Design a protein around this ligand. Structure first.
Ligand SMILES: CC(=O)SCCNC(=O)CCNC(=O)[C@H](O)C(C)(C)COP(=O)(O)OP(=O)(O)OC[C@H]1O[C@@H](n2cnc3c(N)ncnc32)[C@H](O)[C@@H]1OP(=O)(O)O
Length: 151
């Protein structure tokens, strides 16, 4: 079974393992352990007693930023990234959040396709914002409008 839940202190070591195997340009550890607590809505997805994925999000006013989503390589291309994001989007809506923002590497083909498929729109481009092995890469800033439901 696939269980989506709040990512809490105890979950962080396993999440850091996912961060390090999934991200082609991983955060540092200090940054990773710093994106928790006040105004963070952080989620994990548990596939049969193993963490499969996590997502780091911050809520300010009626907007939010997805700072990070990652599915462990063992669990990728199985639909779990989408399911985790979908559950986050639902939760944001119940919190009154009208827009989810993110930035992504222009070459992260897989991430962009997930986002586009969920209805993210390119908003703005930051040229050569991301460091690579040899030079730089653009950052694509994307926004997802989340329309209001009845409760
Ligand atoms: C704001 C940020 O965090 S940007 C950083 C994003 N995270 C990373 O780059 C970490 C490394 N990558 C990952 O962890 C995963 O690849 C994720 C998060 C991008 C996607 O998770 P997955 O679970 O693999 O994706 P999932 O299976 O749900 O598939 C989602 C969709 O993405 C697309 N997609 C996913 N992987 C790929 C791929 N490798 N190539 C092309 N398209 C892909 C497809 O649209 C797929 O949807 P489909 O059902 O329409 O065929």
């Amino acid at each position: 079974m696939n269980t989506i839940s709040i990512l809490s202190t105890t979950d962080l070591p396993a999440a850091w393992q996912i961060e390090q195997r999934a991200h082609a340009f991983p955060w540092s550890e200090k940054t990773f352990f710093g994106n928790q607590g006040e105004r963070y809505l952080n989620l994990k997805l548990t596939a049969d007693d193993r963490m499969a994925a996590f997502a780091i999000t911050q809520v300010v006013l009626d907007e939010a930023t997805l700072f990070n989503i990652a599915v462990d390589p063992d669990f990728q291309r199985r639909g779990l990234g989408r399911m985790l994001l979908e559950h986050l989007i639902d939760e944001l809506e119940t919190r009154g959040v009208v827009t989810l923002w993110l930035e992504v590497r222009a070459s992260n083909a897989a991430a962009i396709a997930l986002y586009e498929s969920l209805g993210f729109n390119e908003a703005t481009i930051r040229r050569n914002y991301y460091p690579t092995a040899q030079g730089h890469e653009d950052a694509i800033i994307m926004a997802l409008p989340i329309s209001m439901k009845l409760h």
